[PDB]
């Protein structure tokens, strides 16, 4: 039993909700919140920009030190950093950005990072400003993640379409 509330159950381990991941994180304080990161951990917009804003830019400060030490992530890769005031940890995961021409096949690799954590609060990778089809992202998530994932979908019209079209 966990403290996530109001989710629809899609499969044995995948759950979904119309919610702002920022507000969800502040309520549950999950062990892991997933950020929709880029390889430079520049949290300027989308989910990443919103999460960072909620940390009063502390996420960006920590991220800049991480990049200065380690260099950029790989597309499809991840790193674990602090969750600041939102969660114990933030798993920064880089899904491919279609608006940069990045390979969509890398979306499965991106979701594989979730399997290193027993329970996660997450957005749909590569959706939104990353340019991929959120319906497809949900399919890859369900077919790749085996650990318990609680998906927050910000757009209500999209949440309804994701539910109604889910196979
Ligand atoms: C890009 C995507 C799939 O995560 C969705 N995004 C968010 N999902 C959850 N929590 C959020 N908080 C701030 C943004 C945000 C942004 C727009 C979207 C398409 C509905």
In CATH's first tier, which class applies? Alpha Beta
CATH topology: Leucine Aminopeptidase, subunit E, domain 1
Q: Quickly count the domains.
A: 1
> What is the strand tally?
7
Pattern of helices and strands: EEHEHHEEHEHEH
Largest sheet: 4 strands, mixed
Spatial strand arrangement across the major sheet: 1-2-7-6
Which overall shape is indicated by the principal axes computed on the Cα atoms?
globular
CATH superfamily caption: Leucine Aminopeptidase, subunit E, domain 1
Explain this structure.
This protein is α/β, with parallel strands linked by helices and 167 residues long. The protein has a single domain, classed as Leucine Aminopeptidase, subunit E, domain 1, CATH 3.40.220.10. Helices cover 34% and strands 19% of the residues. It has six helices and seven strands, in the order ββαβααββαβαβα. The strands form two sheets. The protein has a four-stranded mixed beta sheet with strand order 1-2-7-6, sandwiched between helices. Helix 4 crosses helix 5. The longest helix has 13 residues. The protein binds ligand A1BAZ. The ligand CC(C)(O)[C@H]1N(c2ncnc3[nH]ccc23)CCC1(C)C binds next to helix 1, helix 2 and strand 7.
